[PDB]
Amino acid sequence: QVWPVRQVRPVTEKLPANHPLLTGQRVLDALFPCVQGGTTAIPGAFGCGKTVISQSLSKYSNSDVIIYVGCGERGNEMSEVLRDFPELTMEVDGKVESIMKRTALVANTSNMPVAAREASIYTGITLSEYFRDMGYHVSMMADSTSRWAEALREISGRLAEMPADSGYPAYLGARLASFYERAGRVKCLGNPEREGSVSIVGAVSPPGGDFSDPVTSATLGIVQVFWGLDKKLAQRKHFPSVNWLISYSKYMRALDEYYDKHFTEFVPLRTKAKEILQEEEDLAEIVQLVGKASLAETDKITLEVAKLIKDDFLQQNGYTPYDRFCPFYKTVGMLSNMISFYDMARRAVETTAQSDNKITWSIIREHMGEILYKLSSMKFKDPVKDGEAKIKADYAQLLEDMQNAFRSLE
Amino acid sequence: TFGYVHGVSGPVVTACDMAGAAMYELVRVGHSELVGEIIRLEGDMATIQVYEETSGVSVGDPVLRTGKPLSVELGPGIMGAIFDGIQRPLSDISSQTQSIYIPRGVNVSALSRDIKWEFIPSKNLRVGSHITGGDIYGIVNENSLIKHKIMLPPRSRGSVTYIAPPGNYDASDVVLELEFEGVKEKLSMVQVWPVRQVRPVTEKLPANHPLLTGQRVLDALFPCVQGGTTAIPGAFGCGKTVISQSLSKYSNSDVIIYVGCGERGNEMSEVLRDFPELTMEVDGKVESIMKRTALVANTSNMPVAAREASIYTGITLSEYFRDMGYHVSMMADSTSRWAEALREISGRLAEMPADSGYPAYLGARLASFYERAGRVKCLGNPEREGSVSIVGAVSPPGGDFSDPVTSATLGIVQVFWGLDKKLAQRKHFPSVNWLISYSKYMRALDEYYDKHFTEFVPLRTKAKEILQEEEDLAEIVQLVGKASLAETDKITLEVAKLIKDDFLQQNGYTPYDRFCPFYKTVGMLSNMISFYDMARRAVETTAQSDNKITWSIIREHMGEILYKLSSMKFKDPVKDGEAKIKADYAQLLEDMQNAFRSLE
Amino acid sequence: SLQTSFVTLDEAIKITNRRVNAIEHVIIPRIERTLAYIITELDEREREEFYRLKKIQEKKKIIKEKSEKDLE
Amino acid sequence: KDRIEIFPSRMAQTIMKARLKGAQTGRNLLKKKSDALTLRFRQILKK
Amino acid sequence: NYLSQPRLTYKTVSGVNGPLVILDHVKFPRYAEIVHLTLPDGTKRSGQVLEVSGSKAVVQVFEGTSGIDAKKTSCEFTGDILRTPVSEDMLGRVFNGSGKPIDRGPVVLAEDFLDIMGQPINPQCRIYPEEMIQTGISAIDGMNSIARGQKIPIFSAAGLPHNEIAAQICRQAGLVNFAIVFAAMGVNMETARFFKSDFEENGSMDNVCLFLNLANDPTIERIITPRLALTTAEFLAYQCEKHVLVILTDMSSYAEALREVSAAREEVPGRRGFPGYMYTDLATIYERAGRVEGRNGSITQIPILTMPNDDITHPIPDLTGYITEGQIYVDRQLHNRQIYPPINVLPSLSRLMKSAIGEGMTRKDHADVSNQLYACYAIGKDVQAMKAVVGEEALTSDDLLYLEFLQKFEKNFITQGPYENRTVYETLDIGWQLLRIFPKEMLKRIPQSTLSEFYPR
Amino acid sequence: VCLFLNLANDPTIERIITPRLALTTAEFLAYQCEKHVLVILTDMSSYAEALREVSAAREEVPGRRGFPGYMYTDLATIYERAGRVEGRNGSITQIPILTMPNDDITHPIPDLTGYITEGQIYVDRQLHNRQIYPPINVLPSLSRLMKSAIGEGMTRKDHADVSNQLYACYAIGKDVQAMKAVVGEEALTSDDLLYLEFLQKFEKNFITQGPYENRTVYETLDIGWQLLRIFPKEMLKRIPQSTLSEFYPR
C-alpha cells in the first residue's frame, strides 16, 4: 500500500500511555522514564551520547520494532548500526535471533541532499505508524530533529520567507508538533483489536550546546520527556551524560500505577534518589565558597551517597558487557542498596549525635569502607554470566551486611 | 568618455550612459569632480559610492570614468610627501589653494608635475634591448639618502625603442619607449598601480634578518624580522610614540611609511608636526627623516573611503619601495580606526554584520594586508632583494584583546610588543610588558645570531626564564615576605630587578639610550647573566656548607659589580666606539670573575 | 592573649580569603561569562532584526519594480 | 554552572554590569579586611 | 562520452554586484555550471552559476569581480559543472586553491574528470572504520585513538602549534599503500613554506599532494580548495585503493569564506552570521572520509581549525564537532607552560576509538585505562579549582594525589618531543605508571580483572 | 461546560479563530444568557505562534522576536472580552494559560499579556524542581483587583494586611536565601535566619496544596497567621497595630 507521508494514519482512539519503555540505561528507566507511546527529546551538545542513547534504546528495549532515522547524522552512524544489529541478538521462545530482524533504518546522512532530511523524518514516522497499526509497540529514533529544522531553514531561506529566530521559519513549531503528536498508544483501525504504539525519541542537537535554541525551546514545549545531556559530564566521560537537575518526565503519574504493581518498593526509592541529588547541588553551592569542613555529618553522608549515585548508579558504560544493558531488576536492586545505606547511615548519625557516643561520616567510612567499595562494585554484576537469583541474592546480602555493620556502630 | 548622474541618495550616486564602466573603477562625479568608486553595474547604468560629500550633485551632471580602479601614482616626488588615504597630496593642496581646508573634489595630481628631477638612464640599455617588468631603466637622484630606482611597470615588457639621455625631467616627460606585439608603450616616470592589488615579485623569501629598533627589550627579547608583521596596543597611556620615534631615529630600514587610519585631528597634527623635526645621522651628516618617509595621514572626518584605503595606499607605497630593493618599514597608528572605516563602508553597502558589527571579510582583509609584508626577490633583472615590515597598531576597547580587529590582528601578526600603561605610570620607558609580549621569529633569527652573536641564544633564554621565575617568586614574597625565600630565589629576584631596572628600561630621552645597538645590548645582557650564573653557582656550590654564600654576602663583598652593571647603560656609541664599549664590558666580566673567585 | 588573638586572626583571615577567592574565581567569572553571553546574544538579536529588515526593504524594492513594469 | 542564565536583554546586560560592580567592590573591601587582619596577624607573630 | 557541442560565449553581463556577475539572454542555463570570464584587459577568470532564472545566470566569480565590465566582458559557458583533472601523478605535486599547478610543473594529465562535489557514499557500502592508526603521539594513541578512515579534527586556539602537531601526524602516522593530501585555506606563506618544507625534508613528496590557498589568494577559492583535495583523495583512495590521509588547514578560513559569500548574497544567517546551511556544507567536506565495500583504500581526515576567541561554542568548532567523529583539542593552558604537544585530553574524545582498541588492535586494558585517566585528570582539575578558593589545607590526602596526578600526567603522558615517537603499548605502560599513584581501590572506572592483570605491573 | 479542542497536530491557522470562538460563546452565555462564564485559554503561546506563522507568510514587518507588530492589539481583542456589564447579572472571568518560552518573563507573549491582563499568576520551575505543587511563585505573581476584591463584607477584614506582610516576608526570605548562596550561611543575622526559616515553612504550608486540597479563604488566612506569628510582633511592619492586637496572639 502507498501512504501520503504528511497525512497521519488514522486510529480508532489515542489511548493514555501507561507502560514503561524499558531501555538500556539506569537513569532513563529509573529516574526519567519514557512510556510506550511517549514523546521524548534528547537535547545535547556534540559528543554527549545522544546517538549512544538512540542506539541503546534500539539495541536494548521492550519495543517490538524500531525505526531508526539517521536524519542528517554522520555517515559512520549507519555503518555502526549495520555492523552491530546483525551480530547483536535478542531471544524469543528459546531461539537466539538478530535484532536487525526487528529494525528498519531510514538513512539520510549529513552530506545527502538537505531537502531529503524532511522526507526522511516523515518516512520514518510513516513506517512507524504502519507497524503501530499492526499492534506492534514501535519505537522511532530521530537522530537529529534540529538537522531537520535546519532543512526547513534552508528551503525557507531559498523561498525568501520571513524568519522567526536564528533564521528558522515561523511554522517550525507546528512542523515539530505535527511530528511528535504522531506518537501514542492506540486502538488501531479495523476489525481485530490491537493496542499498538509509536514512541518517538528526538535527539535534538542545539547549536553551540545551548538549550535556549529555538528547536530545543519548541521541542521542550511539545515532548513529555527531556533527557538533557550536559557537555561537562561528557567531557569527564560521565556517561550517560543526562543532567538530572534539568531533565524531567511528565509520565510518572501514569507509570506509578505500573510500579505499584510490578515494583511496589520503587516509587519511594525514585523519590529519595532525586531528593539526595537535589540536596547535593544545594550543598555544593555552599561548599565551593567555604570548604567541605562546613557541612554537618548527615550532609557529608548526603554528599557521599550522591557521589555513589553519580559514579555507580547514574553512570553506565554502554560498551562493556556488564553495563551494555541494565534490566530493571538490576537497576532497582542497585538503587535499593545505595538508598538503604543512606537511610541507615543518616539514622546512625541522627540516633547518636544526641550523645557523647556520636557516629560521624569518617567513623562510618573507616568501619564500612569495604561496604562502600561493594556498593560501587554492584554495576559489575553481569546478566549474561549471572542469573537473576544470583544478582538478587548478592544484593540481598549487601542489605544484610550493611544492616549488621550499622547495628555494630549503634 | 563620460556618463551622466541619474540619481543620488547620500553618498550613493546612480549614473547612466555607464555601459563601458567596470566594477570598482574610479569615477569623477558632478561638475566639482567628486571621487567615487563603482559598487554595482546594472546594464548601461552604474552605482557609484561617492567618497566625498555629494550635497549639490545634480541629475544630468557629467560622470567621467577614469580608466582605473583606486590607484596610487608611484614615482619620484613621494619622499617627504604627506597624502590622504586616497593618495591626494595634502602639502600641495594647501600650497596651491592657500586655504586651510581640503576643497571638495580636488583634481591635484599626486606627484607634482612641473618639478624637474635629475634622471640618469641605466647606462647599459640601448635601442633594441630586451626589458621586463620591474627592470630599472634609470635612477632619479631626488635625495642624498634615497635614490629612486625608476623601473618598468610589472605588467609591461618588450624591446626598447627609445631611452631619454641623462637630464632633467618632470614626472610626465616620456623617459622610455618600448614595443611588444607591434604596440608601443610610452612611459612616464610616474607609474600608476591599483591599490588593492599586490605588486608581484620573483619570490616571497623566508624572513631571516632582524629589524634593529635600537631598543633593548625589543631587539633582544621580542625581535621583529625585516619583512615581519607586528602589532602594538595603540592606546593613551601606553607610549606608542616611543617605538614610532625610535624606528624613525635609528631603525635598520631604508624607507618608512606611516598610515593614519583616521586618527583624532589633534593627534594626527601632532605626528605631522613632529616628523619634519626628527633627524638621523647619515654619512656623518645629520638629516631630517622626511628625506626617507611618506605620511598617509587621515583624520577621523576624512571620507570613509580614504580611511579604509589608507592602509592599502601605505602598503602600495611600501611595496613600491620594496621593489626598488629598499628594506621598507611601515606603521599604521591604529588598524582599529581602519576597521571602523571598513565597518562604515560595509554599513553603506548594506552588507550583513559578522562579529561586533564588523563585515564578514574583516579577517581576510586584515590577513591579505599583513600577507603583503615580507622579504622578496624583486621583479626584473638587477637581482635585488627588498622587504616591507608592517607595524600595525591595535586599539582594543578597555584593553580587551578579544575584540575582532584586535583578535584577528593578533591571530596574524608574528610579533606583539605589548606596551602597558602600568609601566608608563612607573616611568619604565619604553613601557613594553615582557609577559604579554611575544615573537614567533626566533627560529629564523637564530641563524643570524648563530653566525654573528653565538652567545645570545643562551642569554635570551636565561633572561626570559629569570623574568618568568621572578613573576612566580613575587607571589611567594606576598605570601611569606622576601626574607622567607631561598638564597637561589633571592639572587634570582635581585638579578631580575637588575634586568627590569637597567636592561629592560631605556632612557630614550637621553644620548646614551637614544638608541642601543645590538653589540651594546648583547654585551650588557652577557654581563648580567654571567653575574647571575656565577652568583647562583656560588650559592648552590656552598649549599649545606658552614660558610654559605648569599646575595647579602655578594652585595657586601663585591657590591661594586652591581654598581658597575647598573652603570653599563650610560656608555655612549657616539663618544666611544663599539670595540671600546665591548672592552669595558669585558673588564666588568673579568672584575666579577675575580670577585666571585675571592669568595668561592 | 597574643596566642588567643593569633588563633582567632588565623581563622578570620582564612574565612575572609575564602570569600575573596569565591568572589574572584566563582562570582565574578559567572558574571563576566554571563555578560559575554548576553553581549553575544544581543548581537544575535541585532543581526536577526537586520536580516529581516534588509529582506523587507528588498521586497519593497521588488514591489516598486513590479509597479513600474505594470505602468507600461 | 558556568553562567547565571538571566535571559539575554538590555535589562539583563545592565543587571550583570551592576552585579559586576557589586562583586568587584565586595572583593576590594574583603581584600582590605584580609590585608588589615594579615598585618595585625604578622604584628602579633612578631610580638 | 565527451560533450561535442561548441561552447557559447556571452557579452550579456546585465549586472555586477559583490562577487556576482548576472548574465542575461543565456540559452538554457545549467545550474552550477562553470563559466570562464575574460575581462577587458584579457585577464581570464572563472565562476560558477549559483542561480538560474529563464534567460539569467548569476555567476559567482572565483577571482572576484574587480574590473568586470558590462560591455567588454566575455563569459564562455563550459556546459558542465566544475571537474578536477585527477590522476595518480598528483602525488609529488603542489597546486593552488583552484587546482592550477604552482610547483612549475605542467598541468595535470587527467586519468578522470571527477565532479568536485563527489557523490554521497552509500551508507550500506560504507565500511565501519575498525582498524587503528598510531599517530605516534601518546595524547592521541592512548586516550583519543584514530581509526583508519576516521575524520577527526584538531581544534586549537590562535597562535598554538597545531600545524606542528598536524605535521607530526604526517611524519609519524602508521598502522598499529599510503598517501597524503594536504589542503590549506587562507594560510600565510610563513606557514605554507613550513608544510611544503617539512614534506620535502622528510622525503615524503612521492606520496603527498598539496593544495595551497595562501592568505592573499582570492577568498572564494577556499570553498573549492578542500573539495579539490577530497576529490583527489577519492580518486587515490577509491579508484587507486590507497590509504589516504587528508589534512585540511584552517577550516576556520573555509568557514570565513562561507560567511563572506552569504553576506554578499544575503543568504539567511545562523549563529555568528554563518550560513544557515553551514552544517550541510561542512558535511559535504567532512563526510568524504572512511572505508568502502570492496575497496582496500580509505580516506582518513584530520581537519585543523583555529577556534575564534577560544570559544568551543562558536559555530565553526560546534558544527565541526557535530559532524566529525571526535575532536582533538590543543590549549593555551598547556602551551603557555611549554607543554608540547598542548593536547588537552579532557575536552577531547575519539568517537571511533571504542572500536579501534582491545585484542588484535591493542592491549586488552586500553579501553579501561583511558577512562580512568579521564577520571583522574578531571578530578585533578576539579580539586585544583577547589584549591584556588580554599587552599591545600582543606583538600584531603586523596585530593593532593589527584593534584600530583595532574602534574605527573601533563609532564609524562602529554609532553612529548616533536621527533619522539611513542607506541600505544609504551603509552599504556606510562598510563599505568601514572594510575599506580593511587591505591588500587581508588580506580573506580577499571574492572577488577584488568586491575589484577595490570595494576601491579 | 463547552470545550474547544485544537490539538497540537491540528492545522495552525485554526488557533487564530479558536480563542475568538470561545470568547464569542462566552459573550453569548454571559451577556445574553446571564451565565457566570469562566474562560480558560490553554496556551496563548501556541496562539501567538499562529499569528507569527501567518504574518511571516504575509511578509509583514516584524515586531521584536518576529511576532507581528499588532500582537498587542490582537491579544487585547482576546483578553478584553471579560468583565461584568450594565443591567446583566452574567460575567466572563478569563484565565489565559500561557507558556513562557525559555522561562523568560520578558518574552513578547507573556510581556504583551502582562500589559493587557490584570496581572499574572506565575508558575516557577524552581518550585516545581522541589516538588512544591502548585509551583506558584507568589513573588512575580500579581492580581490587580486583589486590593478591592477583599475586606469587610467580602472576606475577613485582615486579608489585605496578612497578604501584604506575607509577601514582604517571602521576598526578604528569598533575598536572605540569596545571601546564603553568595556569601554563606554564617553571613546571616538572627533576623535573616528567621526570614529563611519563614521561607522554608511558607513554601511547605502556604504554597503547597496537592491537586484536591480545597482550603477556604478563612483556612488560607488562618495558615497565613500561623506563619506570620513566627516573627516577633514588631517585625510585622505592614500590619496596623489594631489588626495585630486581634489576630497576632493566636
Ligand SMILES: Nc1ncnc2c1ncn2[C@@H]1O[C@H](COP(=O)(O)OP(=O)(O)O)[C@@H](O)[C@H]1O
Ligand atoms: N553510555 C556510554 N557509554 C560509553 N561511552 C559513551 C556512552 N555515551 C557516549 N559515549 C562516548 O561518547 C561518544 C560521543 O557520543 P555520541 O552519541 O557518538 O555523540 P553525539 O552526541 O554527537 O551523537 C561516543 O562515541 C562514546 O565514545
